[PDB]
Amino acid sequence: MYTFVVRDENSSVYAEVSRLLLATGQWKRLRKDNPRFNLMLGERNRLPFGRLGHEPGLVQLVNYYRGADKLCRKASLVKLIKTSPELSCTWFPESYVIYPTDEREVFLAAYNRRREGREGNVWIAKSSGILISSEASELLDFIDHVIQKYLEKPLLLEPGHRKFDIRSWVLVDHLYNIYLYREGVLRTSSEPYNSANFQDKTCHLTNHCIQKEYSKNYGRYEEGNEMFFEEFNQYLMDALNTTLENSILLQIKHIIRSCLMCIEPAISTKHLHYQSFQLFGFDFMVDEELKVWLIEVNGAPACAQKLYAELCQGIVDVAISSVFPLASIFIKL
Amino acid sequence: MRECISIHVGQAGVQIGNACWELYCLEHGIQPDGQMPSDKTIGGGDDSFNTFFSETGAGKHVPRAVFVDLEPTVIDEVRTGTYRQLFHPEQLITGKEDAANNYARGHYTIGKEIIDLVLDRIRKLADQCTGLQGFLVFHSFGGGTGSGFTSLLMERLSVDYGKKSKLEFSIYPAPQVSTAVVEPYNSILTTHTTLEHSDCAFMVDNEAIYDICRRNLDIERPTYTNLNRLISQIVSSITASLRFDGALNVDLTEFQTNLVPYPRIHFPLATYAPVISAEKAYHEQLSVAEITNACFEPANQMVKCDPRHGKYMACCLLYRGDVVPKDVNAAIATIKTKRSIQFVDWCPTGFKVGINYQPPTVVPGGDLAKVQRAVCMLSNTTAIAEAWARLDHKFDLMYAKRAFVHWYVGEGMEEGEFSEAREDMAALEKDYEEVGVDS
Amino acid sequence: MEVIELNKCTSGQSFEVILKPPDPSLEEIQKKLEAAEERRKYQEAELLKHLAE
Amino acid sequence: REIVHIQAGQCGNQIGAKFWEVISDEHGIDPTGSYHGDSDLQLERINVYYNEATGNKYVPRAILVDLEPGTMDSVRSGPFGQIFRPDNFVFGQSGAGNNWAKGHYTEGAELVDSVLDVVRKESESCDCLQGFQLTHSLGGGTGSGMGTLLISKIREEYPDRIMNTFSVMPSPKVSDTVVEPYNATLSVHQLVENTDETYCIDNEALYDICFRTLKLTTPTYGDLNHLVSATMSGVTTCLRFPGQLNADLRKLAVNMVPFPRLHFFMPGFAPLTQYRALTVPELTQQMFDSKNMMAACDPRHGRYLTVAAIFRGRMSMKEVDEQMLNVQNKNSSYFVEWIPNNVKTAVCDIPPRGLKMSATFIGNSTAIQELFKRISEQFTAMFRRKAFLHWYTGEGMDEMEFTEAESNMNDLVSEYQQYQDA
Ligand SMILES: Nc1nc2c(ncn2[C@@H]2O[C@H](COP(=O)(O)OP(=O)(O)OP(=O)(O)O)[C@@H](O)[C@H]2O)c(=O)[nH]1
Ligand SMILES: Nc1ncnc2c1ncn2[C@@H]1O[C@H](COP(=O)(O)OP(=O)(O)CP(=O)(O)O)[C@@H](O)[C@H]1O
Ligand SMILES: COc1ccc2c(c1N)C(=O)O[C@@H]2[C@H]1c2c(cc3c(c2OC)OCO3)CCN1C
Ligand SMILES: Nc1nc2c(ncn2[C@@H]2O[C@H](COP(=O)(O)OP(=O)(O)O)[C@@H](O)[C@H]2O)c(=O)[nH]1
Ligand SMILES: [Ca+2]
């Protein structure tokens, strides 16, 4: 009999993983504070990695990689890409870290060069509360975060002339195999993209929460402003005479592999007294040239409603039962 | 030449001391009768090995050691063992009934009745030293004597020998290796009372030694002998600089100077490689790069923890065997490009290296195989604070219910000392966080 | 990658390599011990008083 | 590390006799006190229970007490009767008539000084007295009433020594008189205050084991005592033989008793007694099974505060750890989580006679409250009508003392339930 504990009741993904573990009849849930567990579904903040792997006779597995925050924090992601020789980088937007070390002078230097050069000088500021503007003075006065080139030429879906972003779910097991769930989702803006009104942040912000609130034609084109790959692939074939795999997925797979392999030596649990795995949420942008851009990585992502069953089952088979056998939906990168 | 006095307290300290002095004698060519043929200065001398051994007119080389235990069964094995001739009776001190795993019993009740005797037996060794550096103190955290009496002795040593340095070799409790239930209590209580009196303490987690013995020596159920012989190899690597000609860590003061920038954070992490089974028929000898790389593997550390998620304040590389500076720098450079080695901002990103040409010595018939080169790394990492967090948490679980507290109060200890000690550990944990963590 | 303070002898050598620049008194102890003894004495006197009753 | 053994009353002396028979055999001591063993492990800690006389004779450090001579004449005529020190037989002629008041206040008071004289003489010849162990029943008069009077007087003279008892709890299934709940409740009051460790041996459990497990349709006291001596030998192995850890009565108490009043242990033993040796998994499963507990309490009805487990015989110590870790790791709900690593395991190479390996269980469980609840109910059923009280008021006791003992035992029950919900 395998044992596990739950320390993040607010996790929708692992509430289903927890549920599935019981249905197998070979997993028993323990109290959140019992140290004699094989599997820990830990909390988001201050997970006590230091107490894992010291219980004799217990092989212990946790669902978070210590140190993966480097990738899943907007500020630290920018620093990681800049200072990592394996990243240096053509798929991450020009970003700068600005405190309210700091890169103010370096940011304005490039900003001025673009201004005189006639090039589009629209940037976006965000933190871990979003401001989009083409005036540097307005961006900095709002911070008093990370400033990042706002992709002015995004690929717009038709009909609707609307924006979108792509969410990919990636599972990394204790062996540091990288598994890409073959089912993604597009978060679609239901408002036509207006490149002359950055003040209204509804046709510019892709978040499902913003579309469900401020968007008044929400859910017009797709259910819940979520388009899945089968539909998106067919659209690319009909409209652009290409496939999702060729035009976008190759780049997504490359970006995923570059980020995770870069930080592998720092977080791998290969020769550690406990083992780790983690589900990541990669968010990408696509421009009109069919170039994929990485936007951010989420370390505690939620899943699409119609994808919880399949993915969560995939977590047990690949990430858990691989360490605790009982009595593919992923693409291995 | 300046002398060092070793002090072994409780069962763990005594049996580990037995392993160390057995190994010292093998390394210096000293026979169990105390004779040393290679020593041509009969009845005297100020050679490097004289910092640990005095000499009698009859040519016997006597350890500068004191063995103290509150019950006699463990020290009685020294008196009748293979090295019975080495020590004279004054050095071996035993009571009649132990501290029953009770810090308060060893510190207050029984400690008060034997502390003056121990100090006087120590004073008699000091009186034989032209220039005493300080003391090396071996003990367990979890034992009633190792915890409770050691903390008392350390206080009085600071009073009687103020200018002298004191180093600790402390055995951290692990349930795999015969622990008492109250050992977290004793660990926090003794760390709190000893903190201001120790200049540098080397913690050895029995869990780590246990797993190295299972994994590398292929011993299913490691015994204390297996554990102590491995521990003595690490201890010998740490003290070799005091016993042999050299230029690195030549006196006890140098340990604090090189490994401890801030006094409270005086717990360097020790990593040792290679540990090879003597029963292993065919074995391929590891290189300088390979043993140096192994120093950054958690599986080889004396305390299990992840240095990748801490910051370094100092790192010392102590090689024994066929090693030349050229090969060390080559290995270091490579490891820099592959390993996560983050130093604190206010410290140089560097390594103090020491090489002794004599390869490690192994007890004949032991579990360790002779190797051509070995290395012990001493690095002051904030990662070692993980061991404090684990320990403090176990303390919190029991103390919230006051479980077993009445045993300590019954020996004259006030309940306040529990919270006082715990508060000190909380401050210690916070000091590590301030030093090595980013917001 | 600088090497400094190289010291060589017949039994080995040491050096430093840089990869990147940057108490209670005896009286107080005796009181502590005697204070604990008195508390043990008081507790035993209570036990003996309780047993005498 | 000398222990002084005291056995009082009928039950105490019959169980005590068997104990000395069993461990004398394990240590190679014959009925005449001569050692004829073949292993140095038998003599390494022989002094814990035996003295040395001229001619390499070993004499148990045992004091035999009773208020009537009958049962102690039997001991002196038993197999090992000649091994006991003749001066250590201390007996009267009146008996206690299954009456706690007589053992504790009238008949026993007359004899207690003589016992303390023998205890004093045994203690004075001890290099470092470890503590005392007493065998007695709680349902009679001498072991219960005088036995606890002895404990009170030993504590007064040796306040810093450990007091350990093997206490046989009465049961209607194996009853002699109806006043056993009175005698037991009065005794538990004493034990709660004046012992450091008490092995609760429930005669209801001993009967059930003989009837249900051993298939003995008509169990006798001899059959019940076979289980007690095997248990006593088990829970004293760690005191009698060399081990990796040197353990004595005080280290046992420190690790088993997290709160002073909760020092009542459930003992267990496997295998219950065949030529087929058990596997380590079988020993481990049986030693934790309710049917192997010597106290008729359901462990699943409470939680373990601490556990000690002793394995005897030549077995895989690796496999022992794997199975012991298996029990805790798969039944974590019955172990309090606020005492880390509260299950300690020990191994002894020397097995008990007639077995190639065995396991002895010592549990400090909150389920033991069921034992005191049972006694409390039987006590109250009679006390509410003052039934049979005249046997006690006739010896100088008044009802208030019965009310106090009942209240104190009900408090003990509330304490166990308090930590069962921690
Ligand atoms: N590595 C190692 N650990 C030991 C040894 N002996 C005891 N220990 C550990 O020390 C702790 C118990 O402390 P002890 O040294 O045995 O107790 P003590 O200092 O003699 O004090 P007392 O309670 O009076 O017996 C446990 O955690 C044991 O695992 C040993 O020889 N080697
Ligand atoms: N450089 C850029 N160019 C174009 N659009 C951008 C952009 N940076 C951010 N956005 C838009 O802002 C939205 C949210 O930015 P952000 O990185 O903060 O996601 P978020 O963290 O607020 C919610 P989520 O966890 O789902 O990504 C994205 O969905 C995207 O549409
Ligand atoms: C709850 O955990 C524990 C329980 C018991 C012990 C410890 C411990 N940590 C512990 O360290 O000392 C004791 C001691 C012991 C054991 C069993 C015995 C016994 C003991 O002592 C004389 O006498 C009767 O059967 C088992 C372990 N052993 C070393
Ligand atoms: N297990 C066991 N119980 C006994 C034995 N003799 C008596 N008893 C029990 O002890 C109680 C009677 O006490 P007893 O020892 O005979 O009276 P005492 O001589 O005054 O101490 C009853 O509960 C009996 O069931 C015995 O040999 N073995
Ligand atoms: Ca000389």
Ligand SMILES: [Mg+2]
């Ligand atoms: Mg995000």
Ligand SMILES: [Mg+2]
């Ligand atoms: Mg000891």
Ligand SMILES: [Mg+2]
């Ligand atoms: Mg009777």
